[PDB]
Amino acid sequence: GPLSVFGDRSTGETIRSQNVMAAASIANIVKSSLGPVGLDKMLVDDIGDVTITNDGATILKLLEVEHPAAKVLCELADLQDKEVGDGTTSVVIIAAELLKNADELVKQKIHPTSVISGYRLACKEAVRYINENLIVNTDELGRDCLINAAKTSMSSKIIGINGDFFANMVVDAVLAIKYTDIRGQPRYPVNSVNILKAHGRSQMESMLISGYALNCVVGSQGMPKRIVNAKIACLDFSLQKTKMKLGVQVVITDPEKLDQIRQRESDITKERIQKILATGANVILTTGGIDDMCLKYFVEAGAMAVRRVLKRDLKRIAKASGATILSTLANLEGEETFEAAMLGQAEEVVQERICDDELILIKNTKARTSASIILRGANDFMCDEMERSLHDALCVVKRVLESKSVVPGGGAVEAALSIYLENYATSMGSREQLAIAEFARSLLVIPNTLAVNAAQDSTDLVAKLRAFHNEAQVNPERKNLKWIGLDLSNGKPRDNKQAGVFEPTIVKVKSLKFATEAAITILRIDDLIKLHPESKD
Amino acid sequence: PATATSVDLRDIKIVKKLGGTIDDCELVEGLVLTQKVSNSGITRVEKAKIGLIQFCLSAPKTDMDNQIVVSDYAQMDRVLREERAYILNLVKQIKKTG
Amino acid sequence: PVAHIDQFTADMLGSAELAEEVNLNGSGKLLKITGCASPGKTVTIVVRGSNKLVIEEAERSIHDALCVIRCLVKKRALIAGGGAPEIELALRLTEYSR
Amino acid sequence: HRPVLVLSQNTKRESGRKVQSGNINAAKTIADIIRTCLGPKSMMKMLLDPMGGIVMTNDGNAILREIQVQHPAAKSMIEISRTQDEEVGDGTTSVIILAGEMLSVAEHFLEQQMHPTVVISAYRKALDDMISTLKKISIPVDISDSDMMLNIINSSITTKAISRWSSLACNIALDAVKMVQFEENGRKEIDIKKYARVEKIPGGIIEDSCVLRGVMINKDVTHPRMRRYIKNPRIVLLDSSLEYKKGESQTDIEITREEDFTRILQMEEEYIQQLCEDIIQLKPDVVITEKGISDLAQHYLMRANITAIRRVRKTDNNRIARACGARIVSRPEELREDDVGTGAGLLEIKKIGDEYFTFITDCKDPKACTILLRGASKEILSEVERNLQDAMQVCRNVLLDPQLVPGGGASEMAVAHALTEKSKAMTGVEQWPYRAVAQALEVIPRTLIQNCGASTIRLLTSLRAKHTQENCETWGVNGETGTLVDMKELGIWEPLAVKLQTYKTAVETAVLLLRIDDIVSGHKKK
Ligand SMILES: Nc1ncnc2c1ncn2[C@@H]1O[C@H](COP(=O)(O)OP(=O)(O)O)[C@@H](O)[C@H]1O
Ligand SMILES: Nc1ncnc2c1ncn2[C@@H]1O[C@H](COP(=O)(O)OP(=O)(O)O)[C@@H](O)[C@H]1O
Ligand SMILES: [Mg+2]
């Protein structure tokens, strides 16, 4: 008679109501961590680890989910870090409210393919309207655009101070790693900034190290820990005793030739260490291993040798100091040449005190003048929060300098799109106009969440918010009310042009493209079959 | 077309990568590989000549069991320096091809 | 495919106008060879997506699109769709049954 | 058995007032544990370890590390005292009481329908005004004076258990930092953990404890023919072994002739005698290595009158290299005249309680010393070791920052009147949480009278009236008697780095725990 599957089958409006409650179970979590009045959470594990964070990606990655519609919204937050980097609480609330308003349409016996086709006409029109209603590029504002866009990202986190201490350190970090490319591409690789953590003084003592901050120790306590006018030798091979390979064995037939082979394992080893040290090299960085026999040659000659450094840290030092990453001997059948003209340069390599640990600093690197940020917090829970908040702040200034276009934040984009799409649904709307009209109400949840978390008036402040944006579209008298946002500290609509509340363009363009595409896949689960777990057979 | 009535779909490779939207799909007629570049210091070359090599550029070894007998002081120098001269003749054979 | 280094000559090489590693913003990066002298009967389709579930559906929908043109190579004939031939199979076989 | 269609299985959800007012009570609970361990009239707290040991101490850091809590906000306060223990020495118990009081007044404003971001923005404005107040009431210190530095370290150990032997523990902790203050290149550093080793030996009296001018280890001589008393030895430090070991290869010898097996056994003896001839070219007296010494190496050093020590630790070799000025070499055929530890004083192999101890003392200018602790048992010697670590780090902060703050309640009352007078020009909704930071600083003079049994009403009313005038400004609480004595006459002075780290950590602890409105618990990880 029925289906003889050994799992479970649920059809109809059961799964159509379960996917909305699965998406609302995720959105109601992250609704309390949006905007400058948002608050952080606690993520306690079974082993006892506590993670205090408010970013939309760190919470949903550590949180376990079971529903298939819940894994779509959790993987939607992971894509926002790679594509944009701060846009990762706002996408989850929009994509869940896109399913909440579309559930009210399919309960009115409206076909979901008209809602899918109605959402594509509203998503492509939202990108078209936001690209024709921008204020200015990065020429008029200058450095004031980079600082004000950085403070908007920090307002939802622990580094949202009233001053410009953390804002100036981010702009000075991205501007110091300007790496040009072919065909006129000024790239800004923000992954080259080594963000370090140390439980020390307050947040106002966060050092901006112009150069690189290596997270390693010297090793042997007989080397000079401060070298002025240093020459960095970046190399990746273990400075240990000469061990033969698997194909080579030592089969001796004469007992007199025994001790000459035993001394040869250290003579070939020390032959490399004397030709890399006679060329003026004082700092040697190694990703392999330097044993206790080879540490004597640096104490005797007065050189610094750092062992077991990361491979991702050696590439950031050799590119910034002009050093060449050498793995072995080379240069056309040469015995030991080392190409001594390709040594790195540094002004000062100094191991400072980082509150009961050792940290090596390189000052200005003499070639590229890179930057590294050492964070200072109260405990380890604040340092993990300060690292995530700084990494999201580095991604904001990266997209502004690459794509010179900013949009007003604080719900100013979602207020203008809530009224333009209602007029867009009336012109060319015959049967898909109800999906475009619900696309505007789903976008209004971003200024609605700012009024809930601020404990302000909800149905009056957003009603006063769209009152200025309606007069900016139907009354062409140059009212300039396209930048009207929210003042959550006062509870009144303010102008985000003069207040300095700036967000990048692709933090909302890619947010509206990812949330609309995720809402289509969850809208097509009218039939769902769940099989039994095959564990013990 | 107009020469054969069969078509193999195994000549059309489909690469699945997470990121972007469906409008970011591409119809590149060349080769798309998912492997990384070691070393990644260049990652771009125009007027490139591509060569497929099935030889292993490493230490000399045979299908039979091969061992190195070291019974002299200078014999350890003749193992490391001849292995560097072996693969240098393999790289210079590759480099002089173009 | 070059197996031995003694047969590695310029005739066994390829050609490419641009062979670069396109640094993507999403899940890593891939290679992309653009242009080649005397191209073969192969092509590569790069499929993107916002979730890992949309790319698996887009892979099956592309294969359902390439198989439609595959049927037109074997039989160069097509009919009207959208419930069109099922009605004509229902009326002509009813008159055939009488 | 069909599974239940749930989402986020086996985890908890909690939000609202139960998390904001729930983390306050977890912070008030830890502050009530160590509340009786701040003043000089404090008492010890006996703790029990899961290993079977006993930690009897009154220091605020050592108490909180032995407490395993299950509350997530309670785990944050333990990491606060761990941060204060690594930055400064005597900056532990004061931060946990102050962060509990700054959250005690923060719970009042959360009931008044005020947003937590308004209290934190008032806390950050109050934190920037507490740093500027301590820099105005500071005083420059003459670090070259010996009697001035003794009064700073005596103020930090009056709370601890070594206040009875204050005349001895101040001279030990001052001479320990001034010996290890080493400067090779253009960078001053003080390493009081890797070079100032504090070794404790059970037995004797505490009055016989003294800081040695050199190092000491628990190691006997390798052979009884070797000398146990050398006047001026030339110590050579080694790192490799004096034995014959297998090489890092696959070496195998085919023995076909009769004379081949006896030759390899003779070449093993000639290899040891070759490296023993290379170390006697500099004419040493003491050979110290980290690996084993074979008996063939002991024979050649016996007739050459060389005392050899066998298995000295690697951390002890780095400490004796600074005292004698030697170089830890790892190759006997690469020894130089600069690698010989000349200038070392008397070397004596004493025995303290049926166990030999190698003493290397009486050096000319050692850069590393060892504090010899001798007491009743290992229980109270762990107390003096933890108190000398809090006594050497408070001397390190003065040598890097010679500024003193008047402690004993005078530091907190000088800023609480500065925050009160500066709050008159606020005129906003952040004015009232700005006033609560000055009232939260009152818990430090509250604790000094609650431990000695004095009144908290008649004293705090008179202490608040003493800071109404701008002339005196340094009146604190005397924990010995219980009255109000000026700190210029008592001599209780705390360093600037202790009071700055106390205020910077107590505010930012309240910054982190006030932004927490949700707690998720019950998930696993990798
Ligand atoms: N000063 C401000 N005034 C009004 N709104 C703000 C202000 N600063 C930030 N916001 C709002 O807070 C929101 C924070 O979003 P966020 O959680 O950072 O997104 P994502 O999770 O993608 O990084 C932004 O959408 C922005 O509109
Ligand atoms: N003789 C004294 N008179 C008044 N107060 C004192 C006296 N001795 C110590 N104190 C006070 O006792 C407190 C002890 O603090 P403590 O717990 O040692 O801090 P930490 O935990 O950082 O070491 C100091 O803040 C100091 O003001
Ligand atoms: Mg103390």
PDB file of C-alpha atoms in Angstrom, chain D residues 212-300:
ATOM      1  CA  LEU D 212      73.660  32.591  48.134  1.00  0.00           C
ATOM      2  CA  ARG D 213      76.127  34.496  45.958  1.00  0.00           C
ATOM      3  CA  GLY D 214      75.962  31.818  43.298  1.00  0.00           C
ATOM      4  CA  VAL D 215      73.992  28.677  42.528  1.00  0.00           C
ATOM      5  CA  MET D 216      73.440  25.322  44.214  1.00  0.00           C
ATOM      6  CA  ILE D 217      72.240  21.907  43.036  1.00  0.00           C
ATOM      7  CA  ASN D 218      71.432  18.546  44.631  1.00  0.00           C
ATOM      8  CA  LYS D 219      74.184  16.493  43.009  1.00  0.00           C
ATOM      9  CA  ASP D 220      77.050  14.405  44.360  1.00  0.00           C
ATOM     10  CA  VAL D 221      80.471  13.923  42.791  1.00  0.00           C
ATOM     11  CA  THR D 222      80.833  11.140  40.244  1.00  0.00           C
ATOM     12  CA  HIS D 223      83.827   9.534  41.986  1.00  0.00           C
ATOM     13  CA  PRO D 224      85.006   9.634  45.628  1.00  0.00           C
ATOM     14  CA  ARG D 225      88.605  10.354  44.560  1.00  0.00           C
ATOM     15  CA  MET D 226      87.440  13.694  43.121  1.00  0.00           C
ATOM     16  CA  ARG D 227      87.818  16.757  45.327  1.00  0.00           C
ATOM     17  CA  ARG D 228      84.817  18.050  47.268  1.00  0.00           C
ATOM     18  CA  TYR D 229      86.438  21.379  48.230  1.00  0.00           C
ATOM     19  CA  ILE D 230      88.147  23.540  45.589  1.00  0.00           C
ATOM     20  CA  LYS D 231      89.227  27.100  46.392  1.00  0.00           C
ATOM     21  CA  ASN D 232      89.127  28.715  42.924  1.00  0.00           C
ATOM     22  CA  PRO D 233      87.960  26.210  40.295  1.00  0.00           C
ATOM     23  CA  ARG D 234      87.878  26.746  36.543  1.00  0.00           C
ATOM     24  CA  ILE D 235      84.410  25.435  35.693  1.00  0.00           C
ATOM     25  CA  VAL D 236      83.806  24.169  32.147  1.00  0.00           C
ATOM     26  CA  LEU D 237      80.158  23.617  31.206  1.00  0.00           C
ATOM     27  CA  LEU D 238      79.314  20.894  28.691  1.00  0.00           C
ATOM     28  CA  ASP D 239      76.101  19.949  26.905  1.00  0.00           C
ATOM     29  CA  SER D 240      76.894  16.725  25.028  1.00  0.00           C
ATOM     30  CA  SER D 241      77.777  13.360  26.554  1.00  0.00           C
ATOM     31  CA  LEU D 242      81.198  12.038  27.540  1.00  0.00           C
ATOM     32  CA  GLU D 243      80.224   8.508  26.455  1.00  0.00           C
ATOM     33  CA  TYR D 244      80.184   6.450  23.258  1.00  0.00           C
ATOM     34  CA  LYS D 245      76.725   6.269  21.680  1.00  0.00           C
ATOM     35  CA  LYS D 246      75.312   5.065  18.381  1.00  0.00           C
ATOM     36  CA  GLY D 247      75.321   7.518  15.502  1.00  0.00           C
ATOM     37  CA  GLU D 248      72.248   8.819  13.696  1.00  0.00           C
ATOM     38  CA  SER D 249      72.587   6.342  10.835  1.00  0.00           C
ATOM     39  CA  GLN D 250      72.298   2.632  10.021  1.00  0.00           C
ATOM     40  CA  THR D 251      75.931   1.798  10.790  1.00  0.00           C
ATOM     41  CA  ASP D 252      76.848  -1.903  10.781  1.00  0.00           C
ATOM     42  CA  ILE D 253      80.366  -3.369  10.852  1.00  0.00           C
ATOM     43  CA  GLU D 254      81.226  -6.679   9.188  1.00  0.00           C
ATOM     44  CA  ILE D 255      83.829  -8.466  11.320  1.00  0.00           C
ATOM     45  CA  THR D 256      85.645 -11.127   9.291  1.00  0.00           C
ATOM     46  CA  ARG D 257      89.177 -11.016  10.731  1.00  0.00           C
ATOM     47  CA  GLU D 258      90.280 -11.847  14.265  1.00  0.00           C
ATOM     48  CA  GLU D 259      91.876  -8.470  15.050  1.00  0.00           C
ATOM     49  CA  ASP D 260      88.796  -6.468  14.010  1.00  0.00           C
ATOM     50  CA  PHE D 261      86.645  -7.064  17.103  1.00  0.00           C
ATOM     51  CA  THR D 262      89.406  -6.096  19.537  1.00  0.00           C
ATOM     52  CA  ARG D 263      90.172  -2.962  17.504  1.00  0.00           C
ATOM     53  CA  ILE D 264      86.634  -1.537  17.731  1.00  0.00           C
ATOM     54  CA  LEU D 265      86.652  -2.029  21.510  1.00  0.00           C
ATOM     55  CA  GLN D 266      89.967  -0.141  21.616  1.00  0.00           C
ATOM     56  CA  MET D 267      88.725   2.649  19.327  1.00  0.00           C
ATOM     57  CA  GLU D 268      85.825   3.236  21.728  1.00  0.00           C
ATOM     58  CA  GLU D 269      88.345   3.853  24.518  1.00  0.00           C
ATOM     59  CA  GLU D 270      90.543   6.101  22.366  1.00  0.00           C
ATOM     60  CA  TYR D 271      87.550   8.220  21.319  1.00  0.00           C
ATOM     61  CA  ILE D 272      86.702   8.985  24.952  1.00  0.00           C
ATOM     62  CA  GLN D 273      90.347   9.784  25.721  1.00  0.00           C
ATOM     63  CA  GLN D 274      90.470  12.144  22.724  1.00  0.00           C
ATOM     64  CA  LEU D 275      87.610  14.312  24.000  1.00  0.00           C
ATOM     65  CA  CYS D 276      89.036  14.085  27.528  1.00  0.00           C
ATOM     66  CA  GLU D 277      92.369  15.395  26.222  1.00  0.00           C
ATOM     67  CA  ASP D 278      90.585  18.308  24.525  1.00  0.00           C
ATOM     68  CA  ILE D 279      89.011  19.543  27.774  1.00  0.00           C
ATOM     69  CA  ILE D 280      92.257  19.460  29.803  1.00  0.00           C
ATOM     70  CA  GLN D 281      94.092  21.793  27.404  1.00  0.00           C
ATOM     71  CA  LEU D 282      92.559  24.789  29.209  1.00  0.00           C
ATOM     72  CA  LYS D 283      93.500  23.284  32.639  1.00  0.00           C
ATOM     73  CA  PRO D 284      90.032  23.139  34.263  1.00  0.00           C
ATOM     74  CA  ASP D 285      88.955  21.980  37.709  1.00  0.00           C
ATOM     75  CA  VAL D 286      85.200  21.282  37.460  1.00  0.00           C
ATOM     76  CA  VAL D 287      83.518  19.614  34.468  1.00  0.00           C
ATOM     77  CA  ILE D 288      79.714  19.893  34.427  1.00  0.00           C
ATOM     78  CA  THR D 289      77.556  18.291  31.723  1.00  0.00           C
ATOM     79  CA  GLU D 290      73.907  17.362  31.192  1.00  0.00           C
ATOM     80  CA  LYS D 291      74.229  13.781  29.888  1.00  0.00           C
ATOM     81  CA  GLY D 292      75.954  10.733  31.312  1.00  0.00           C
ATOM     82  CA  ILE D 293      79.673  10.322  31.925  1.00  0.00           C
ATOM     83  CA  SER D 294      81.137   6.883  31.277  1.00  0.00           C
ATOM     84  CA  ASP D 295      83.652   5.251  33.608  1.00  0.00           C
ATOM     85  CA  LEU D 296      86.383   5.575  30.970  1.00  0.00           C
ATOM     86  CA  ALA D 297      85.904   9.350  31.121  1.00  0.00           C
ATOM     87  CA  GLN D 298      85.909   9.241  34.930  1.00  0.00           C
ATOM     88  CA  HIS D 299      89.331   7.561  34.935  1.00  0.00           C
ATOM     89  CA  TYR D 300      91.074  10.207  32.825  1.00  0.00           C
TER      90      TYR D 300
END
